[PDB]
Structure formats: structure tokens, C-alpha cells
A paper describes a structure:
Transthyretin (TTR) is a transporter protein that binds to retinol-binding protein and thyroxine (T4) in human plasma.
The EC50 value of α-M was 15 μM, indicating that methylation of the 7-hydroxyl group reduced the inhibitory potency. Although the mangostins were found at the T4-binding sites, just as in the known TTR stabilizers, the direction of their binding mode was distinctive. Whereas γ-M can donate a hydrogen atom in the hydrogen bond with the chloride ion, α-M cannot donate a hydrogen because of its 6-OCH3 group, and thus the chloride ion could not stably bind to position 1.
Author numbering:
A (entry chain A), C (entry chain A): 10 to 125
B (entry chain B), D (entry chain B): 10 to 124
Amino acid sequence: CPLMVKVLDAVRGSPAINVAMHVFRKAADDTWEPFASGKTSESGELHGLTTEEEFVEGIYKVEIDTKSYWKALGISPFHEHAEVVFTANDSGPRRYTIAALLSPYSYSTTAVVTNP
Amino acid sequence: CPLMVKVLDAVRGSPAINVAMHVFRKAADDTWEPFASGKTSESGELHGLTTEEEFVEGIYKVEIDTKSYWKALGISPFHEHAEVVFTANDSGPRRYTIAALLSPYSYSTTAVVTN
Amino acid sequence: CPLMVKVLDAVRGSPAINVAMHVFRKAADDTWEPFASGKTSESGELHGLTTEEEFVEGIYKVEIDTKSYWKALGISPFHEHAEVVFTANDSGPRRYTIAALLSPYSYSTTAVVTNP
Amino acid sequence: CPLMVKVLDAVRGSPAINVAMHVFRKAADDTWEPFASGKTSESGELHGLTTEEEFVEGIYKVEIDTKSYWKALGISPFHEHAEVVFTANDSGPRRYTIAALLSPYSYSTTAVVTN
Ligand SMILES: COc1c(O)cc2oc3cc(O)c(CC=C(C)C)c(O)c3c(=O)c2c1CC=C(C)C
Ligand SMILES: COc1c(O)cc2oc3cc(O)c(CC=C(C)C)c(O)c3c(=O)c2c1CC=C(C)C
Ligand SMILES: [Ca+2]
Ligand SMILES: [Ca+2]
Ligand SMILES: [Cl-]
Ligand SMILES: [Cl-]
């Protein structure tokens, strides 16, 4: 699959399991159209969001529901969510791994982009 | 000022200067009402965005135009922008410092909340 | 293997390939004894540093030669190296993945610790 | 002061206060000669470590006792400490601000180098 998200927890030193996220694609009219959604597995990964043929050029947003993750562990975190917005496939098809590292008052996000 | 934003550049080891951002508050209809903006100073800081009276409880978004910053440096970036979305003042007024550390394919953001 | 290191490059959005690192273990006399070494593969990972039986309880240091990585790309970075020092297996055997995300003037490091 | 260290806590969203650290310079025999130390203030900052005259070229290490900080909060940490090792002043004297963002199983460190 050309899009994978991995989420880690910096407090427990573990994958962040069962984290929900929704992916949107910017439409011709400039609205955010729903594109895919899912939750992280026991390895903190979410695979199978899309296919090479469906994942056309465009601007995509991944909104990761980090607040519900922390609240289920008892913590009231700073962020409502962690958002990643990016233009994809502008130079032809690529594979994207987006990683998010979570703490109650901080997050980091990174992308590794590879040419298939 | 109960809201300050500081932006750092991890490629050059410097404050990220002249970075534009806009601040929004979530409206009753779930849309984002812009209410403040500015660009970072030579210290990488943006002060004076709001006042204690105006900065009431609500959900706020800071959208930092990281892509324009990297374009200005001739460096290809991954993200369109860096967004920070948070509920403010849920226990009473707080002073917020939001810091963002930028790289072309990564960013970090952190909040320091003081009383 | 119970110890794996992954290194990513935040400037290029890629694994950090051919990054050298050395692992040390603190001896009874408080010196750092060489333990293992290696370089990252094309996926930015270094596997096979040790075995469950050899990786006894102790304090371990991983020194990742990030300066030579950046210098080979033309960049004079801030850090001489990225070091990770930790006590391992204090509560019984665990598997450790240590991730390092590199920029010229910043690095982050994280550990995921799992119970085999 | 050409060297300042600032430490932030990503769990509590606060400066990391009373964090101890030691600064070393690499000696001719490849050993680490300690020469300064201190603990962070209520702002998470440690100033006054050295002077412009004393802070000559060399390789310097800052060892931050992150484990003691997390132990004081009752939180199990991964790292023994956070080390920052760098060559200073290789092009002339610079002012260095080293920032460290702490979580129990992760840290980040960044340098802002100003002239
Ligand atoms: C990139 O790591 C840094 C950095 O280099 C500088 C930083 O500067 C800060 C300055 C601040 O005033 C405050 C508020 C502290 C009060 C007591 C109100 C900060 O939180 C920071 C920083 O966090 C800071 C950081 C860490 C930020 C990251 C790694 C996203
Ligand atoms: C820089 O953000 C990333 C990233 O881009 C890729 C990452 O890849 C990882 C792969 C891993 O196998 C593991 C172990 C997970 C298990 C369930 C054993 C990882 O922790 C990561 C990553 O942490 C990772 C990260 C985050 C690391 C940082 C921000 C220093
Ligand atoms: Ca949400
Ligand atoms: Ca070295
Ligand atoms: Cl990856
Ligand atoms: Cl700074």
C-alpha cells in the first residue's frame, strides 16, 4: 500500500494501539472530502487505507485522534488531534510512511517517502 | 499575552524568522473563525496575538505556513503547513507558549502551559 | 533479536542509510566495554547486534555517528554523535527498538520496549 | 553567556525545573574534563555556565540527569541521561542555546546557534 501511518507513545515506550484517524483529500471546490479511515493495530500501524490507483495526486490530510487515546489512559492532553497535511504524488507515484510520536503536551511527525 | 508562538529551524540551527501563521477559534457551526495572525520576529517569536479578556475558553487552531518558509530557503518540504489544535482555558486562564521545531520532512510541536 | 536501531533523515524524508554506530556495556569497574557495532541498511535499520542470551542486564550505550552521515551529504551538523544510554532487562528480558530521527541541528530518540 | 540550556517536560507541559546537568570539555587524552554544572531554574533554564573568554574551541558534552527528574515525579524513565556532544566555536565564538524536550521514553535536543 502507498500510504501507512505508524503511531508511538513516548510515555509508555510502546506502539499507540487503537488510535483512530481519518484521511481527507482536498476536492476541486476546496472542501475536504472523506478519503479513508481506520485505527492502529497492536503494532501501532494502520495499513490498507488506499491503493496505488485510488491514491491520485492531490492534497491529503490525516487527522489522528490523539485526544481520545490519552483520555482513555486517564490523561487530559494538550492537542485535540495531530494533523498531517501534504501534497502527494506530485512527481509521480510514491509510497508514504507517516510516523507520529505522542506525548501529552507534544507530538512529532515525520514522513518517509520512497520511490516504488 | 496569554498566547505566544515560537518557531525554530532544525536545518540551520536558528530561529525560524518571518514565518506567517493564522489563529482561528472554532465557531458554533463547527467552522474555523480566523481572528489573529502575524509573522515571527528575528527571535522566531510571535507575541501580541490576543488579550486575556478576548482569549476565552474555546477550541483554537494555529496554522503555521511552514511550506512558504522552506520555499523561501530553496528547500523542498513535505507538509503544507503545521497545525496546532487545542482547547484553551478549560480550567481557567492560562498562558500558553506553543513551540514548533521545523525540518523539511518533520515537525514537532510542544506546549508549555503556565499559571 | 532483542536490540534493533532504526535511523531516519528528517531533511530528505528517507531512512538514514550506512550510518555507523557502536554499542558499549558498562563493566563492573565502571568502564564502557565494547559490545557490538554495525551500520544501518537501506531501510535505515541495524539488526543482529546481539542475542537474547548475550544481552544480559546492564547499562548500555549506543553511540550513533551522525556527524559522518551529515558530512558525507555536505553538511556540517551540530552534534558529534547521538547517544542513547539505558538500563536493559532490569525486570527480565525485553526487546528494544531504538529510533533516532536526524536533522543537522537536532535529533530525537525514542525507545519501544516490548515483553517477548 | 555563550551557552544556555533549556529543558521542557512533554508530560506536564511545563519547564523541567531543578534538572541537574554537568558540562565537560574533551581533554588531550580523549577523556571528559568536567568544568561546569548547575540545575535548571523555574523557567527550565540554566544560564551562567561559562564566559566568552573561557569558552574556547573544543568538543563539549552536556550530560542532563533526566533519570533523576523522572524519578522525582514517580515516572519510570528509559534513559539514564540525555547527552549533547558538539564542537564549539569552530568558525569563531557563537552563542549556543541547547534545548531538550523530555518524555519518559523519548527526548529531543536542538541547538540554536547565533552570531
Ligand atoms: C527545539 O527545541 C526547543 C528550542 O530549541 C527552543 C525552545 O524554546 C522555548 C522557549 C520557551 O519560552 C518555551 C516556553 C517555556 C516557558 C517557561 C513559558 C518553550 O517551551 C520552548 C521550547 O519548547 C523550545 C524547544 C523545544 C520545542 C520542541 C522540541 C517542539
Ligand atoms: C521519525 O518518526 C518515526 C518514523 O518516521 C519511523 C519510525 O519507525 C519505527 C519503527 C519501529 O519498528 C518502532 C518500534 C515499534 C514496535 C511496535 C516494536 C518505532 O518506534 C519506530 C519509530 O519510532 C519511528 C518514528 C518515531 C521516532 C522518533 C520521532 C525519534
Ligand atoms: Ca477530532
Ligand atoms: Ca564519534
Ligand atoms: Cl519509516
Ligand atoms: Cl531558542
